[PDB]
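Please predict the structure of the following assembly.
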Amino acid sequence: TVVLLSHQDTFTSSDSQGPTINVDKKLAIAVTIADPECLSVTVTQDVLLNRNAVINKIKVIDKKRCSEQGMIGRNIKKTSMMLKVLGAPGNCIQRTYLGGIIQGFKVVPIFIGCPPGKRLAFDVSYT
Amino acid sequence: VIHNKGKERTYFSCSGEGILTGLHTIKLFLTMDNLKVRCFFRNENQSPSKEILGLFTSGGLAPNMIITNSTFYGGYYFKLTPFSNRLEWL
Amino acid sequence: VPFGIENSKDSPCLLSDLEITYSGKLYYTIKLLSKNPLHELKSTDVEKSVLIPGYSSFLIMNITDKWTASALATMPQAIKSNLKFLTGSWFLYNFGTAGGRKWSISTRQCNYWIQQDSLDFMSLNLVKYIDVGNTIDFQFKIIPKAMSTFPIPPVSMVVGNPGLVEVKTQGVFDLNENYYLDIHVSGRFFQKGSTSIALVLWEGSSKCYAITLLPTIKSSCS
Amino acid sequence: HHVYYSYKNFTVVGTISTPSGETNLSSLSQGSKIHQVLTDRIGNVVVKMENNVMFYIKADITEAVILHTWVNTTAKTVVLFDKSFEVCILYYNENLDEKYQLQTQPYPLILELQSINKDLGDWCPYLAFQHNIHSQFYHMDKGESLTIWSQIVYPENRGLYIVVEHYGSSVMTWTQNLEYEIASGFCTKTMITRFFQTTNYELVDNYYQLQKENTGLMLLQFRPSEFSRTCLTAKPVFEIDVGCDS
Amino acid sequence: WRYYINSQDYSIFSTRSSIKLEYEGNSFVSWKIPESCKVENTTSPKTTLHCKRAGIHTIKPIAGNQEVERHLTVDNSYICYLWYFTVVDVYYNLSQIVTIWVYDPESASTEELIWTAKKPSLSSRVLTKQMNTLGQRPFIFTVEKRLTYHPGPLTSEGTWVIHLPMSSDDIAKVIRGNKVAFQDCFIANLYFMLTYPMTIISEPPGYEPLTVPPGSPLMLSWDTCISTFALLATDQETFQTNDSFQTWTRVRAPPGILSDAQRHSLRDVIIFDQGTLFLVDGTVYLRTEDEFTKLDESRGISETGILGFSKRRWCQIRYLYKLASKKSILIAWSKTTVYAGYAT
Amino acid sequence: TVNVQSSLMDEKLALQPCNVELLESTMINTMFTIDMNSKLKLSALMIPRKGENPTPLVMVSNPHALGFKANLNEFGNTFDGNSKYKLDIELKQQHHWGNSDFNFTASIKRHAISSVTVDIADKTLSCVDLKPLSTLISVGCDMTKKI
Amino acid sequence: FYDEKSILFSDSNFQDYVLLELSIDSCWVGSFYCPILGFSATIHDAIATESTLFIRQNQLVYYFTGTYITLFDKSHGSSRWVRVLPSECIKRLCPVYASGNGSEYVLALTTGKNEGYIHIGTITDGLVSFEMVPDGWSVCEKLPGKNCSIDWATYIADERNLLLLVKIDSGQFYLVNFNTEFKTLNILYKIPEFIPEAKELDFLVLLDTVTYTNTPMTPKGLFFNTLNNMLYIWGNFILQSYNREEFIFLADFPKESTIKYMVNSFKGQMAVVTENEEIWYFLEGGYDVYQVVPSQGWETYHNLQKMQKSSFHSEDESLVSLFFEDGKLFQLVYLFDVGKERLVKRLLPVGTLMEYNLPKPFTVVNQGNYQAISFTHTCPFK
Ligand SMILES: *[C@@H]1O[C@H](CO)[C@@H](O[C@@H]2O[C@H](CO)[C@@H](O[C@@H]3O[C@H](CO[C@@H]4O[C@H](CO)[C@@H](O)[C@H](O)[C@@H]4O)[C@@H](O)[C@H](O[C@@H]4O[C@H](CO)[C@@H](O)[C@H](O)[C@@H]4O)[C@@H]3O)[C@H](O)[C@H]2NC(C)=O)[C@H](O)[C@H]1NC(C)=O
Ligand SMILES: *[C@@H]1O[C@H](CO)[C@@H](O[C@@H]2O[C@H](CO)[C@@H](O[C@@H]3O[C@H](CO)[C@@H](O)[C@H](O)[C@@H]3O)[C@H](O)[C@H]2NC(C)=O)[C@H](O)[C@H]1NC(C)=O
Ligand SMILES: *[C@@H]1O[C@H](CO)[C@@H](O[C@@H]2O[C@H](CO)[C@@H](O)[C@H](O)[C@H]2NC(C)=O)[C@H](O)[C@H]1NC(C)=O
Ligand SMILES: *[C@@H]1O[C@H](CO)[C@@H](O)[C@H](O)[C@H]1NC(C)=O
Ligand SMILES: *[C@@H]1O[C@H](CO)[C@@H](O)[C@H](O)[C@H]1NC(C)=O
């Protein structure tokens, strides 16, 4: 879930035409999928104009595709997905004590396969 | 409890009769006898008023005394009484 | 706040162009391009700073001509060339002592709030007793009424005789930059003594009602 | 020669007046007669004289707006909607190539109106009006109810609210619950309206007659308290019919 | 003077859009534009304008005669591209197949802009396959009944192929996509209406024209639910079209049915899917691909008194289809009597 | 039709903005019954203005018959940074609290009525749509009771 | 290192380093078939893979594998530098930054002899084995022209795909793909001569028909990121591609500058070093390259480090190199301080540099009868 706090006068009266304000004209949240055949990314939008807040919930789902029956690290496929705000990278800096941080931009790597730490054991007590 | 929230005004005037200090602050003293104090809500009228007492009593509100120390916390409630005669809380 | 720039009425020099040339010694000579006379520079403007955002700032101090002046420079390494500014590109500020001193230094307003919702922990001075194997846990919240030093925690804490008390501290920031810290205090072994753990808002100014908190931990019979 | 209006269930009836006040649209068109009037779902109305000068009207607004000249006074044109609801102008002329006789060109009505507004200086009293009425037809049986969520955001003390208007058979009941909030120099007034039936049919006599009395169709619209031109919001109108799907 | 934009959708309108300025007049001098906008060939009456900075820009043609100045509002947007679909309907399977691709109005071909195109251009093909490989897929959503239809994989030529039924109950559809932006630009959702195709009347040779009286303004009548199926009656000929007058067909009457002045004296025209109705000198005639009877007292209409007639203006297709008992689709009047015309 | 909220913006009048951002509860919808030796809990949510500090108070129409204990506690803050305060009111019969005098309680055999109101003590004008919360409470028979 | 067979060997991440003279015999293996070039003792194309490290000296390739008990047996470790590929002349040694399939790889590009072929060397459990992947036939056979030369290559551990850019006798460059699992190569792209021209374009999708400026386009190398399947071709330019089919020309990098090398974060950021020793920064979200090091913000940050009296910053310094550590750009630099000259790894906070870039759109707002300079915000969100 990404919360976008907009400026004081980002949205005007012209943005409301239909049942919902056209937020994507001013403030757009975008997702990019590498290898979209076995990943589904769904974005859900909510807007609070009084609080100047945009709540975006991004759900990433595996498509029961890619990889196969393997032993932990042996079947793992590397991929990633991008989430960004259009026009933000390069322009947006989060200024903190000890420096600035690039914002409006993130790449998350995803490994699809048998995760480490799954083990099957023979239960002698119950047996 | 917000410590640096800011307190720019005082609202009550309490007195022990037995002793006191500029009513700006409220300091009390214990002796052998019981600690009995008369207190009144202070608004733009510095004198005791029988309307403010009536309002707070008709809402069912009465003052509380909170006695604190390094290792102590105690609370004493002023008993609800009709404001027909009482000019201030006791 | 942005700060206020010089007005056109006060100084008409801004209604012209600007040329900076490093002079032979260390004075970057200011030159007004427009030869028009309803401009020029009054002598009121000396002990004033010409600046261009993204470049050095020059303190114009010596008036040698109806259209030029002598100034020093802050960060002179950055120049290295003639520089031409156009009208509203360059601005003038007045921080000199001549005609009064506008700038002043003072203390700031309380910028912090300390929240302790637990009863009997609210009082500023408090003494806690620990028996053998017993533990005292408490939590504080700090709300910054302003920017905050986010990478580092806003509270610094010290212990008096750490030899008889072991302290475990956990700190968490949140979305709004509020800072939550939990302190867990335990005794080391069977001995008595007292120690004072002080929690200080190092960033907070001297104007807040409560900056430091001084709990006292006693290993003894309560 | 004139345009007349009736608004809000015939409670506001009158004649459309130009901002100058001359109220006679033929006078502003150099003797031209009104040739065509177009109305769409958004609520904006285009009046085209046979001289090809156009006037703009807005639903529930009693003032017309003359638009800048766009068409040659001698061209033979009509105005029509294209695939989408935008307006286009069709030109017809004899002595063309039999393939170029009918030429359609778009007309940017919203931008022309925006230019006229920037000249005039009107504004919209609210910035956002939101709802969840995504469909125009609502059918339901006895046990079913529907909830309409709407919201309006306006400046801090500009007293505005949402008006719900019904027309037809009042077989249904309403429950309205609103939440009012103030923040950052704006006021948000959320509203939830639930429509349901409260009639019980068990062990009652006259089942079919009562069922007939609780069967019908009604029309509903939600709109802001006050609005003007410069407000692009499309007023939602829908139907609720109680009765079986068949 | 006036101006033109490549895209009819004005959500797309932004700073990157080009505005085609046209001036018609006897004398012209130049174009006066702000510093925020660049015009090409400022001396030519017909030119192009690019306003790279957002705001309200005042444009005026300097000319000998007085000219008005327009304030164009240009706002930067992250909505830049559009959907394009080509539909082919099969009656045997009672369905219809729509091929979809992304196109950019600033760089699309002319036949794409006027929707004549049936294949993606080179630029549109490159854009479509790029937008695919970033992960963007269009889905068609029916507004009246919440039904979603998903495409197949991208075709060798960049297109997504979708199958729909010819429902005739839900005609309003929206083609949508995921939140994938190519180079900081989205694709705008497209609202359309498609249904059973409507066939226009053809013109057999040797037929006679039908016209409005000379000097009378030409009249128009379009279908209530699906526009672009319209009928234009002019002073010279009567035209009918399935699309928004890109292609038209003359509507003409058989010889000997009615007089020459009677042909030139039609006063009102209405269009339906099954046939068209002409009001000629107070009587009413039905034109169909089959036959051209006049409606008379046998059918329930008066003769030589009919002032006019009208149809429904708003598309209430859902309720009327579900109504289970057909009602009137026409109303005519004669200054004394109101006639409620049903189908047939 | 005078719209007082809009009229309370004339520059000549020069009013001050409302100091509370939100004050809401579901208690306003229904009336409540307190039977003998019974109590109930009421809840409200209030959000103040960014800078102002409003003081909420809870009042009862009949203090002789109804006694309340109210607790105001902060629980998280909104996106703008405004703290949200939860107000919990425990309501029961007056004689059971014990702070009342013998003449104040006035017996317990009789039934009575009251109305509890959550309000802002220092609310300004221009607080038109931010009305106080009110609810009617009957200290009397419970109808669903049956033997 | 200029003329010595010395390397910088560092454990940790250049937090500390030792300078070593390698134990190589520095023998001369020049032959009639092998192209003759001046003997220089320097070490080039140093590669350090897990448990093994390769070097190139004057077209000779050596490797040394360390004894890691926790990784494999001690018998695998090597006692002295072992030269690999004796007969061939290797002009360049190319890295593979990913390990696919529990193995490491290194590419060797040959010149003069067997110019059509390339060597791929697999390092598994400290054992190194090389092979010429084109097998029977060379890539020049399938390309137009009399002969060809493979001027750079990358290997994709997944997909078993080998991307290599090939120069033809005519002078044109082709980006070719060879699938190692099969034995089939197909021409992916044909690099255009001359730099495409873009007036008001920030980026340009290289469609078949575009105008061309008259400055020749010289490609130096290419890099492939497998997390997002993104391909970069760099040189006098930068070309970016998502599906190796259509490429996008980034019009912010000037055609006057040439890129020496490219450094990636594998987390969305990339750095570019040119011959002029100026660093450019690229964020994979945007189509923009920013000049970070020669810039106003860097001058501000350097002056601040002077005021704070930082021990890592000096008036005169020389960039040794730069690299990404857990998403942070660390550059190791030699300070020429008088008396206390020293090589040290410093940090380049690019966020701080961007925050201090100072010419920015601003406007003169009005306050209380006074006007002040308010900078115009550019970030779409607060
Ligand atoms: C839109 O606007 C229209 C009108 O502008 C409104 O329609 C109006 O609705 C009214 C009722 O809702 C109609 O008024 C009448 O109301 C009577 C009920 O009121 C009682 O009347 C008796 C008479 O004996 C009195 O003693 C009582 O004290 C009550 O006042 C109805 O009985 C009446 O129905 C018939 O009226 C005819 C008129 O002659 C009688 O002859 C007959 O015996 C019977 O009483 C009628 O309903 C009013 O006529 C009607 N106007 C029109 C033009 O239809 C809509 O309600 C508005 N809609 C909205 C959404 O605002
Ligand atoms: C309704 O009927 C029409 C025509 O009778 C069907 O059109 C044909 O449908 C197939 C289904 O995919 C189309 O795709 C073909 O699929 C095969 C593999 O299944 C593939 O090898 C072909 O190359 C092709 O892709 C086929 O192209 C299409 N025909 C035309 C002329 O477009 C339609 O699918 C039916 N739909 C339903 C919902 O019944
Ligand atoms: C990927 O690496 C594995 C080893 O980790 C290779 O598997 C070996 O391949 C050789 C050559 O065919 C055989 O002699 C061994 O018996 C294999 N060992 C195992 C455990 O399978 C594998 O070949 C490599 N990838 C592919 C597809 O060849
Ligand atoms: C500079 O100022 C000094 C006094 O501070 C003055 O004597 C001198 O004349 C000035 N310079 C010139 C060039 O006039
Ligand atoms: C009870 O109320 C009466 C009425 O004023 C008062 O005089 C009396 O003091 C009260 N008694 C007690 C015990 O509080």
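The helical segments of chain E are 110-113, 122-133, 260-263, 317-322. Residues D 9-10, 165-167 surround ligand 1 (CB under 6 Å).
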